[PDB]
């Protein structure tokens, strides 16, 4: 623990500064440090954790695709070697995040909003592994993503309203999992449509602030349906 000697509150303060500086690698290390303090995370802290690693892994995924595309076109070892380098570092980030979730974020998360959040993240990071998987564990990696998403979905449906932004973001990502990872485009479409319609019918219950939060994610579901249909 590089961050073992820094106060929890200082690590959270520094994560927030790192976000402002666009130093996402630092933001992610600071939030890793905070989780390793062993206390549960607040809503805000969960969002810091997620944003930090999304940003880190986002850069690696983007780099991977560029390198993978060049490699495909090329089909010397250099292209493959460098795509492998980036891929390995990507897998490491996913491994680290899954690490934090299993030791011990998920088992201590009893509230719907925390448990759903973490299980969604678990699905997400298995999905990122799945995006680069080519060998004898691909099927199991994919099934790990499905399993995580499905538990999250079951909890979300039982414990949260249809407009709950966490529930909506989960359905969005599970929908993309179906479309592109499980090669189940009809499932992806059905999930996205059903999720949008059930959210639309519940907007009447919300404040203006909540309405804004929900409709933002509903538009993402719409954006995908437009490309898909």
């Amino acid at each position: 623990g590089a961050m073992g000697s820094m106060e929890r509150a200082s690590l959270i303060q520094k994560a927030k500064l790192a976000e402002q500086a666009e130093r996402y690698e630092d933001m992610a290390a600071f939030m890793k440090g905070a989780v390793e303090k062993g206390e549960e995370l607040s809503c805000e802290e969960r969002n810091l954790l997620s944003v930090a690693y999304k940003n880190v892994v986002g850069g690696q995924r983007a780099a991977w695709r560029v390198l993978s595309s060049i490699e495909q076109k090329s089909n010397g070892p250099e292209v493959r070697e460098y795509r492998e380098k980036v891929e390995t570092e990507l897998q490491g980030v996913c491994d680290t995040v899954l690490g934090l979730l299993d030791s011990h974020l998920i088992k201590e998360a009893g509230d719907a909003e925390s448990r759903v959040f973490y299980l969604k993240m678990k699905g997400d990071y298995y999905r990122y592994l799945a995006e680069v998987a080519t060998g004898d564990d691909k099927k199991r990696i994919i099934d790990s993503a499905r399993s995580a998403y499905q538990e999250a979905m079951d909890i979300s449906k039982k414990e949260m309203p249809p407009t709950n932004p966490i529930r909506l973001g989960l359905a969005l990502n599970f929908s993309v999992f179906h479309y592109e990872i499980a090669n189940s485009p009809e499932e992806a479409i059905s999930l996205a449509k059903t999720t949008f319609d059930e959210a639309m019918a519940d907007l009447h219950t919300l404040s203006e602030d909540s309405y804004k939060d929900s409709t933002l994610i509903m538009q993402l579901l719409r954006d995908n349906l437009t490309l898909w249909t």
Partner: peptide, 12 residues
């Protein structure tokens, strides 16, 4: 690759 909308920062 065409990337679909997923939750949170469009960091890729």
């Amino acid at each position: 690759k065409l990337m679909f909308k997923t939750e949170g920062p469009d960091s890729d």
